[PDB]
Every structure is written in C-alpha cells, then in structure tokens.
Amino acid sequence: MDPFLVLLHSVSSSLSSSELTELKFLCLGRVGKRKLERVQSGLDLFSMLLEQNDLEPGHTELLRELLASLRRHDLLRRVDDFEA
Amino acid sequence: MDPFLVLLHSVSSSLSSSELTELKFLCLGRVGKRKLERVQSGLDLFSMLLEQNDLEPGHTELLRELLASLRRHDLLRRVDDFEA
Amino acid sequence: MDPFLVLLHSVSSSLSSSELTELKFLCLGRVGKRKLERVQSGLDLFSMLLEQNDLEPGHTELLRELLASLRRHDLLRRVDDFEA
Amino acid sequence: MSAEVIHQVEEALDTDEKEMLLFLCRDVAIDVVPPNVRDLLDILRERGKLSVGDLAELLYRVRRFDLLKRILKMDRKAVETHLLRNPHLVSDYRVLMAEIGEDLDKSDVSSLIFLMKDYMGRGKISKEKSFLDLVVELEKLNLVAPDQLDLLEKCLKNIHRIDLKTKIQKYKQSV
Amino acid sequence: MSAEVIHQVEEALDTDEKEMLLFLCRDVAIDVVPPNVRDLLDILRERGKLSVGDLAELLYRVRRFDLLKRILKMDRKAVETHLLRNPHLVSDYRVLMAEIGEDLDKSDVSSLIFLMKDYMGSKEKSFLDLVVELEKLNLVAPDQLDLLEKCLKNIHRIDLKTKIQKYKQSV
Amino acid sequence: SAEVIHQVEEALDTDEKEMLLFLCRDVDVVPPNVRDLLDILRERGKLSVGDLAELLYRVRRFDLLKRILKMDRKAVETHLLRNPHLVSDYRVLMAEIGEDLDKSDVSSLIFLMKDYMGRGKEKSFLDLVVELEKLNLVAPDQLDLLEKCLKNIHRIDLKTKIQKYKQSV
Amino acid sequence: MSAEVIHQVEEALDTDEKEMLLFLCRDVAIDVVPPNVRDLLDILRERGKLSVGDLAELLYRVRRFDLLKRILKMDRKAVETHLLRNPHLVSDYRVLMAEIGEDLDKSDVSSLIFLMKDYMGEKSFLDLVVELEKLNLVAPDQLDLLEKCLKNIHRIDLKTKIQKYKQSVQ
Amino acid sequence: DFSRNLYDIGEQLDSEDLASLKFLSLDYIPQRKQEPIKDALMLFQRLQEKRMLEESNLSFLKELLFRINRLDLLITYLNTRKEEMERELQTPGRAQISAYRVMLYQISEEVSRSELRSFKGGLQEEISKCKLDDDMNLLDIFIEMEKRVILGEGKLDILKRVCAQINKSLLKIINDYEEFS
Amino acid sequence: MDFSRNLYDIGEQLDSEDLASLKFLSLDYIPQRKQEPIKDALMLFQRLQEKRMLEESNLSFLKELLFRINRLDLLITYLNTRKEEMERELQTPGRAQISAYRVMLYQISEEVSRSELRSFKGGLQEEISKCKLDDDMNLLDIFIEMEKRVILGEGKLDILKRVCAQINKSLLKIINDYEEFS
Amino acid sequence: MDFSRNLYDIGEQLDSEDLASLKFLSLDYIPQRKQEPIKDALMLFQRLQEKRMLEESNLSFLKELLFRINRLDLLITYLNTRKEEMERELQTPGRAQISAYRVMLYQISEEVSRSELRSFKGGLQEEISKCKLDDDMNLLDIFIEMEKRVILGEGKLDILKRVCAQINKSLLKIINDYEEFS
C-alpha cells in the first residue's frame, strides 16, 4: 500500500554507499547478477525484491532480518512501529 | 539470508586494510591482477572467489587455510562453529 | 605456487622498518626510484620483484643472497627447509 | 483469455524482459519471427497454442510471480502443479540458456565476444549486445545446439567461471 | 524441390540479410531490379537458373546454416563439396565485397564517404549502398580495385587491403 | 463568392479533408470532392457564408477564415448562436476526441476492438468510428462500448468528457 | 536508334533518375508533356530528336556511366568530346538547377519551402523550382529570388555556383 | 522581412528548448498535431495557423520566449527588454499561458537527475512500468499524470506528498503557487 | 596532394575535449541548432566548408582555430606553418576572424583548475540563483548558459569580475588586458 | 583458437598503470582520437590487430611492448622468450619498431620521484603558465602536453636538458646517452 511504499522509500533514502554494496552482496542468491549490476539505489533493489513477492507487507520478516544483519536497530524499530 | 553468506559477511566485516592487502597478495595465483586491482573490501574478494568454486559452503578448507596465515583465531573459531 | 607464496608472506611478516629501508637501499639498483617510492612493506617489494623474473619458484638463490645482508639465519634456514 | 489480459501483461513488462520472453518463445513459434510481444501473443492466441496455463508457465519462467497474482489470480503452487501435470511449453535448453544469460554481466560478454570473434562477425558485435543475442547468433551458425554444448562449456571455462560449467554438466547429466 | 520452400526462405530471413542477398543476386539479374526478395526468387525460378543447389549456395553465402539443416536438410561439408565441384553462380567479387562490408563499423563508413566526396556527390548508409553507388559511376569493378584499396589503406585499415590483395593474387 | 470554393479546398490538408468528410457525413457514395456538397446545399438552399464559416471554425483554420471570409473568430462565434445545427454536437465531440489520440493510442484501440471485428490495415481513429457506425454500436445516445474500450487504455479525462457531454443533454 | 535499346534504358533506371530526366527534358517537351518517361522517349524517337549522341548526353547528365559503357560501348571522354563538338540539346540552366537540387538536404528544402511560401499560394526542390517557374518568378535570366533565398539559409556555397554560372553565360 | 526573422529565431533552438516549448503549448495545440513537430519552424507555422501568431501580433511568442528564460532572443531579434516584459506580464489580462504550466515547468527545472529517479521510483502504483522506460523526461511524466487525471489543477495532493517525501524546496514553489491562486 | 586526406588526418588527432573547445570557439559562425549533432571533427569541418570559410584556396580560418587551442603541433606537421608566422599574421589588425571576447573567455576557462572550478560554480549562485546543481557542467557550458540569460555579455562583464576576484587575481589581469582594447 | 586464448590471458594480467604505459608507448601507431575509448588491454589488442602488426605469425611487437615495460614473467610464461633472446633480437638495427625517442622518454619517466616531479613542474611552468598546476598528473601526461606545444621535439631537446640539469643529473646522463646513440 501507499504507507508501505513511503516507508520503503524512507528506509531506502538513509543508506550509505558502503551499506548499499553490503546489501547488494547480501542478496546475491535471490537476484541474478545482471539485475544487481544496474542497481544504484536501495529503493530499486527493494522494488526488485518485491517483484518476486518475497518482500511484502503481509510477510516482512526478510526485511527485518536484513536490517538486523546490517546492525541498524533504529530502522528495524521504525519498521516494527510501522504496523503498530 | 543463507547461513554461509551471512558467515562470510561477518568474517569480512572484521578485517583491516593491511590484512586485506596481505590476502590480496596471497590469492594472486588464482585471481588475476586486473580483477584484484579494483577490490576495496574483503566482501568483494570473497564474492569473486565464489565464482571459481574453490570457496563453497560444502567445503571451506580454503577459508581456514587463508585465516591460518593471518593468525586470527577468533575468525577460525567462528568458521568451525558455523559447521556444527 | 601456494607454498612459495605462503613462505614469502611468512618471511615478509618478520621484517622491520630499518630492515625494510636497508633492503630498499640494497635493491635500489634493480628498479627505479618511482617503483621503490610508495612501497611500505617487504611484501610489496616482493610483489614488485616477482615481475622482473629475478625471484622465481624454481631458483631462489637471489632471495637468500638478499636476506644474508640482514644477518637473519633463521629465515635462511626456513627457506632451505622449504626448498628441501 | 481475451485481448484485455494480453494488453495488460504487455504493458506491465519493461524492455529488458521483453527480449527474454521473445527468446523463450522462439521454439513454440518458429515459422515466423515476431517483432514485439503483442504480435507474438496474438499469433499464439490465433493459432490456439496460447492458454491460461501457457501464460502462467511463461510468467513463472520470466520470474515475475507478482503478476501471476495481480492478473491471473494464481500463486506459485498453482503454476508449479500445472508444470508438474502438463507437458513443458518451452524446452529446458531455452530455460538453461536464459539462466546462464542472467548471471553474465556487461564485463563478461565483452570477453566472450572477444574469445569467439573468429567464428562470428566483427561488425555485428560492435553494437551493444547481451548474452541472449550472442546465443542467437551462434545458433544461426549451427555451433550451439540442445544436444551439442561442448564449445559453450569450454568458452565458459576459459573465462574462469566454474559454477556455470557445473550447471552445464548437471543439465547434460539430466538428459 | 517444391514451390513453398521459397516462401519459408522469404519468411525466415530478416531485412538485414535480405539486403545482402539482394546485393549478391544483383549481378546475375543484370536486366531486372526487383525491390523485394520474393519476386527476385520467382524471377530466378521462372528463368530456370534457380535450383536446389543454387538456393543452397545462396543460403550458404548469407551464413544461415540453420535453414540448410532444417529446410534443405544439407550439411556444410556437402554444400562445400558441391561448390568445389559444381561451378558457383555468384562471382567471388560480390562475396568479397560483402565480407569487406561486414567488418566496417558505422564510425568508418562516414570517414570513407567524407574522403570520397571529392569524386562523387549518422545517417544509416551501409557500405553496400556506397559500393553500389561507386559501381554506378564505373569506378570499382572486378578489374579496377585501386581506389578502394588506396582508400582503405588511407584510413588505417590494412587487413582489408590484405584481403583485397589476396583476392587479386587469386586471379 | 462562387469560385472561392476551389481556393478554400486547395489550402486544406489530407487529414483536414478526412475530418471535413467525417463532419459532413451526417448529410450514398461519399463524395471526395466538395462540389457535390456545393450542389446539394445550393439545391437545398442551406448553403451560406455562415455555414462555411462555422465549418472552418469547427476545423480550426482561423487563418483561412480571416483571409477568405474576411471574418474573425468573434463573428463566427456570434453567428454560431443563431442556429448551431449544421453539425450535431456528437460529431464535434467525436472529432475533438480523435484530435487527442496519438499513433500508439489508436493502435492500442484498434488492437482492442479487433476482438469482435472482422479483419478488414493502417487507419486513423476517425476511420474506425465509421466502421463502428456501420456495425451500428456507437449511438449518439449510448456509448457504453466506446467508454469501456477507452477506459482500458488508461485515458480517463476523455471518459470524463464523455460523461459531461452525456449529462449535458 | 531501336525500340529495345530505349526500352532497356527505361527499365534499368530508377524513379529518382526518371524524375530528374523528366525535369531536365522540360525545355524540349514544351509542346507535349509526357507523364511517363517511356512516353517521353517515344515522343523523342518519333520526332527524330532521340539520337545516339542525344541519348549519350542525357545518360551523361544523370551520372550513369555504367549504362553508357554496358549499352552504347562509350566512355566518359568520348561523350564529353561529343558534347564539346556537337551542340547541347538542353540548356545548362536546367543542369545548374539539377546540380543545386542534388545537394540540398530535406531539412534545408523544408526551410526553403517555409521561407518561400509567402510568394506562392513532401515537396522536393525540383517540385519547388517547377512550381515557381509556373508562377513566373525565376527564369534562366533572373536569379535574384534564388540567390538571395539561398544566402538567407546560411548555405552560401551554392551562391558561388549561381554566380559562376551567371558570369559564365555572359 | 518577417519570415526571415522567424527563421533566424527558429535556427537557435535546440531539442531541449523545442520540447520545453512543445510542453508549454499544450493547451493551444492538440496532442495529435504535436507528434509530427520536429523543429521550431513547424511549431511556428502551426501557431500561425491558429491566428495567434502573426506579423502584427507577437505577444504570445514574446512571453513564450520569456518563460523558458531565454532573454537573448528577446533582446536581439524581437527588440524588447526584460523589465517591460515583466511589467506586461504583471497585468493579469495579458498572460495567455496559465499559471499551471508555468508552475509545472519551474518544478521541472528545479529537479536534477537523482530527484528525477526518485520521482520515477515512487509512483509505480499510478503509471505503468512500460510508460516509465527509465529515460523519459520529467515533462513527459507530468503529461502522463495529467492524462490519467491524477494531477489536476484542483488535485495537487499526490504531487505535494511526493515532493515532501523527496525535497523541501519544491514544496515552497507549490505552496506559493497555491497562495497566489 | 590530397586536401581531403589532410583534413581527415587533422581531424583524427582531436579528442572529445578539443572538439568541444573547437565547437565553443566557432559558435558565432554556426547556430546552435546545427551544432547539436556534431560528434566528431569531420562534421564540423563539413559545416565550415558549407559557409565558404574553409577550402583548398582559403585556409586562413583553420590555422587560426588550431593556433587558439594551442595545438601548435598540427600547424607544423600538416599545414606547414611555424608559430612566429601565425603570431605575425594575427598581430596585423583585420585578420582576426574571431572576436577577442571568445578567446578571452576560452583563456579564462583554461586558466582555472578543478578546485577553482567548483569554487566558481558554488559562487555563481549569487545572481542567476541555481538552475541545476550538477557538477558535470563544464566552464564553457556555464559560460554559454550565462550568456543566454544576458547575465554576461560584451559590455556586461561585472558579474564575471565580481566572481573571479573572489577566487584569483590573474583572471582580473586578463580581463583588464582585454578591456585595454576598448 | 589458441592465439585468442593467449591474447586474452595476457590481457587479463595487466593493471591500469601498465595499460597507461602501453598506451603511451604506441602513440605513433595509434591516433589520438582512437585512443580515448580504450579502457582495457583487449581494445588495444584489437586496434593493433586492425593495423596488422599483431598477427598469429607476427608476434614481434607484442614481445617488444612487454619487454619495454619490464614484465618478463609474461614473456617466459606465454610467449616463451627469455631476456637474452629478446635482447639479442632488439640489439641489431632494423628490427626495432619503437622509436628510441619514446623509450628514452619512458626510461626518464620511470626514474623520477614525486618531489622531483614537483620540482620538474615548477621548473618549466614559465611556458605552460599554470595550465597544468594540478599535482595529480603523472610525468607521461606532462611529456605529451609538452609534445603538443612543439617544445619537446625530436630535434628540440634544449628545454628537457635544462630542466633535468636543474633538477638532477642522472636524467642528463640518460639524455646524453640517447644523443650519443644518434
């Protein structure tokens, strides 16, 4: 939904380039190499993930564990507060 | 969120610049010079080594041998704890 | 070869700043000043020397000859055991 | 079923996946070559070779599972069962070629076309290409075939990509 | 050995290869200038010059081997032996020109036309059209190849000059 | 004021001529030449400078209105209120809609409408309204099929225009 | 000389070549205007104006030396010498017009059409020239309306050609 | 003496300026007639057709050239100054172009490439993926939004919210336009 | 002797940056609409050939252009002209087909480093505010953009001096040397 | 098929600095315009193949290039040539396809330190006049720029001698050796 999209955009807008390539490597298996080659922003990678419907408001645990692996507890807390 | 991928990420996150340079020199036999020119973090080197199939989750003797030279017992402990 | 590279790393790991400067002064004849300018470790010098083919896995007499100027018989015995 | 769903599917695909779909559909419609996706879908609908199951299988192969629920109101389980209980619309050789082409970036297609510059032309590869176009060009020259893959395997091994060689070995062992 | 394989041949070939086929068949149809490929093939069939061997040779020149394996059910070695024994229809001059035009990219044809503007009068103008225009003015002929060789040598492309000299040494 | 018809028709365009023919379709074989309309209107007595001015204002060629008829937009607009019955407003609405679709939109429309239409081909939007009238499904009162087909190609402002016209009358 | 030669010549030409030849033969076709180039050739043959030298002249004026060598067994030098000795059927004004029209671009000719539409009441330069001649604005003796128009479009090169022709004829 | 001046003006407008003028002339030129336009001369002739641009009346062209912020052509050929143009445009009765197009064009100017990608990445629900194409200009996105009656004169909510999500500066322009209106 | 061959050899020695500089220097004699599709020196040479400014008999413009971008190698390798001859020819008044304004702007563009470039771009916001803040804009493009909005002109040089004085001082010397002519 | 594999594997073992050195060493056989898009050894190999100087049976130029930049492991591993075998071939006249001027310039380039580079820039700044004051440019770019302005010509070496003598002495030794060769 629109709140989900704006939340995704907000969380993507606050990622560093080092964290960006870290996330790009972290999702090597799910997405092919060619698609990851042309990714320049976190929002684009999020849309690519959503294309396979593994990431969605009905099941967002993957994003939770991704943020946990990123060691960014603030973003995880914001995501948890989103549905509340 | 593959366990092998997250373990490789955690291992690469704890390296330093001098250790990375030493690792780059050590793996000069397999990886070419031009490819090794552009690496900046151990994550890229691990991803590149994943292509030659010498470093795979099934057999991780190469990682143990590489970490033995660096004399980092904590990372070797993490590696052997991952298998169990 | 892998044993040759690991031996070279091991022997380069025990060098010091004064030893590095002495080795650079001794080896200044082989290569230009620019090639010997930004070298900061013995490992970099060994990587540089591997280009000119003067240091090869088949014959390592130049390595022991260079190390003899440093009066480090332990490294000489280590390389002798390696080539055995 | 109708043309409305075909139009909706056509307008929901970017230019990248259109080429993938065209390459995937070459085996089914080999009499003529369609320029765009709309013409190809219209031809298969008119010939009667296109149905709900065929579109579901194509969307499963192109890895766009969301459109299956959004348009066809189906999940991955339904298309998986349909593939299990029905003959394949596309030969496994085509999907293997697509899977290989998915993992090759722009920095490796240049190496491939440089290595295989002798067999094919030089002015044809000057324009920006992708691995699918190179496969098409090789198939025109009768170098790569569903039952003949030694040359491609050797070429992939020469660029030091062992995993794709293992994938080719797995496919050949399957057949 | 029927009249429908011609339609399949027309359908399979794209316009990019159809232009090369038209250029290759230009010399034999010295009095007719068909706009399409289907009518040219029909003219060849009616004249009687077109045959199974002729069609196989023509499709082999365009480098479309899948059509030989599919429609004519012939291999490359069989058609090569046929060419070696049965004298060819299209001259070596035309196939040499096609080979030369294949390797010239878009950035070099513009330089060539700029150089040769003094002899005649990123728009898509392929080398085949330029060589046809030069043939119109009676400058490039299987007897006279000095101009093309000199122009190719003057734009830093020497392997094509080697190809031209090899062709000259052949005759 | 009699031979100026040739001057008027010689300054028009092919698509402009097609739009003019579609507008005059309300009033048999379609005459490509306007002289048949000239004779028919002169026999009817309907032909007038005002009618030609109204037609030119409809087809949006004000330069010819000033050059030939020596009148501005204000004069023809005022004369319109006298009796705006030369062309039905349905035709005007159809022409206005047809002036707002590019090649891609008309291609999508013809592809969608080919579902239950026989394979007659390159044509414009104004060349399909005539086909639908031949099938007699776009009536001046009901346009449900047209609106349904138009909503699918994601053009909602024209749907609102249809709704406004329908509610106006 | 014979019907089959001219038939082959008409068959081997191109539509642009046919249109250029039809324009170039406007001066001699003042009495009758053949819509088709074959009709024009037949009219020339019936009046005796279609000779070997004349046919060589027309073929040389359209730059088709391949047909000259393949049919008439003549080269450029022979037909040039014949032109030097024998009188020219078509005035060089038409040759100049054709040469100017062969070099202008489609965008350039569109801009020229836009500029010159004020005087007059898709279209190639030859069409513009013949339509202007129908309106009697440009003639083989007056060329200011063409020289100034060409200078206005920043193509000053062809002004040199026009002035060279004007000086040469006088 | 007049057509030559128009040709000179039309010989110094590149593709970007042509697209900007084409967008600015959407109300007075229907969409169908806009596609064949490929140069300034065609647009000038088409505007001449609708009798709103003649030798005697040059106001529309003057303000159109002033809107895209190209005063060089105003001062050189048309022989006018910026101050008098501003004074004329200050009068509410001499503005042929509505404030909607001006506001959208200013928003288009203020957005860079990264912000353009940000816009393209936050509206997948509205516009189809095929219509995005990852290379369309911002004006094309705006006209596509206008087609689906998503962004009207009275409907500025979605533009405002995507602005607030992307950039604060564009909100200033939007709200000052609203305050003026 | 082949004029076309010499022109092609001259054009083969110029990269993209020199091509952009050549395009900017000759902006007066070719309008911007014709200047959009120029991607290599051959098209520019043809465009100059159209306007009777470059031909076999008259080479007085190509030599000046190659001299202004300091490509003195081509002036002697192909056109067979020494530096002193060109300097003497340009010294004589009436033979300078390019106004001093363009060459002055080009010299200011050449005499600015990357840090000075970014400082100039940052300081330009005082008057023209900001159109778009992408750093990819070269100094020549920025100069053209400022010239479009009559911010900077032949008689209007106050903005350039004001911005330049905040960065360097030799630019003021160049501007004063140019002003000495008036 | 073997030759293409050998060329690709050789090109896979060349970094950016070696690519720049190879590009500089072959300015004579590659025009300036065609050299800008080159970003890897493969494009350079293709360009050399086009000129018909690197063929399956003609490998002399590749050996010379790999020997000039002092990379002998590649020579012994793939082309199977030792140092002495190549040295004897290069010693005899007539087989050297690289001008002694270019190799002398490269040898001077190798033996210059960073502080010496800064002093080198400072010494001859009187002519360039602060156009290349940025310190991120290596010596090869400076040499190319000096070649553009006909300062450092084949027969014009006074500037180089003066600057090198002002900076150091070994550079003058190399220059004198090159002069003695001629």
Author numbering:
A (entry chain L), B (entry chain R), C (entry chain Q): 1 to 84
D (entry chain K): 1 to 175
E (entry chain J): 1 to 121, 126 to 175
F (entry chain H): 2 to 28, 31 to 123, 127 to 175
G (entry chain I): 1 to 121, 128 to 176
H (entry chain A): 2 to 182
I (entry chain B), J (entry chain C): 1 to 182
From the paper:
To delve deeper into the assembly of the FADD-Casp-8-cFLIP complex, we conducted a study using wild-type (WT) full-length FADD, WT cFLIPtDED, and a full-length Casp-8 mutant with FGLG mutations, catalytic inactivity and processing deficiencies (F122G/L123G/C360A/D374A/D384A). This allowed us to reconstitute a ternary complex known as the FAFuL-C8FuL_FGLG_CADA-CF complex with an intact Casp-8 protease domain. Our triple-FADD complex structure unveils FADDDED-FADDDED and FADDDED-Casp-8tDED assemblies, by which three WT FADDDED molecules FAl, FAq, and FAr form a right-handed, type I interface-mediated trimer to interact with the left-handed Casp-8tDED trimer assembled by Casp-8tDED molecules C8a, C8b, and C8c. Notably, FADDDED interacts with the type Ib surface of C8tDED_FGLG DED2, although we introduced FGLG mutations on the type Ib surface, suggesting that the FL motif is dispensable for FADDDED-Casp-8tDED assembly. Together they provide a type II and two type III surfaces, mimicking the type III-II-III CSS, for interaction with Casp-8tDED molecule C8c (d vs. 4e, f). In the 1:5:4 FAFuL_H9G-C8FGLG-CFH7G complex structure, three Casp-8tDED molecules C8c, C8d, and C8a provide, respectively, a type Ia, a type IIa, and a type IIIa surfaces, while FADDDED molecule FAl provides a type IIa and a type IIIa surfaces to complete the CBS to recruit cFLIPtDED_H7G molecule CFk. A similar CBS, which recruits WT cFLIPtDED molecule CFk (CFk-binding CBS), was also found in the 3:3:4 FAFuL-C8FuL_FGLG_CADA-CF complex structure, although Casp-8tDED C8d is replaced by two WT FADDDED molecules FAr and FAq. In fact, the triple-FADD structure demonstrates that FADD can physically impede Casp-8 filamentation at the upper end.
Fas-associated protein with death domain (FADD), procaspase-8, and cellular FLICE-inhibitory proteins (cFLIP) assemble through death-effector domains (DEDs), directing death receptor signaling towards cell survival or apoptosis. In this work, we present the crystal and cryo-EM structures of ternary FADD-Casp-8-cFLIP DED complexes, unveiling FADD-FADD, FADD-Casp-8, FADD-cFLIP, Casp-8-cFLIP, and cFLIP-cFLIP DED assemblies in a complex. The atomic coordinates depict how FADDDED and Casp-8tDED could assemble a helical 1:5 and 3:3 intermediate complexes, and how these FADD-Casp-8 intermediate complexes are targeted and capped by four cFLIPtDED molecules.
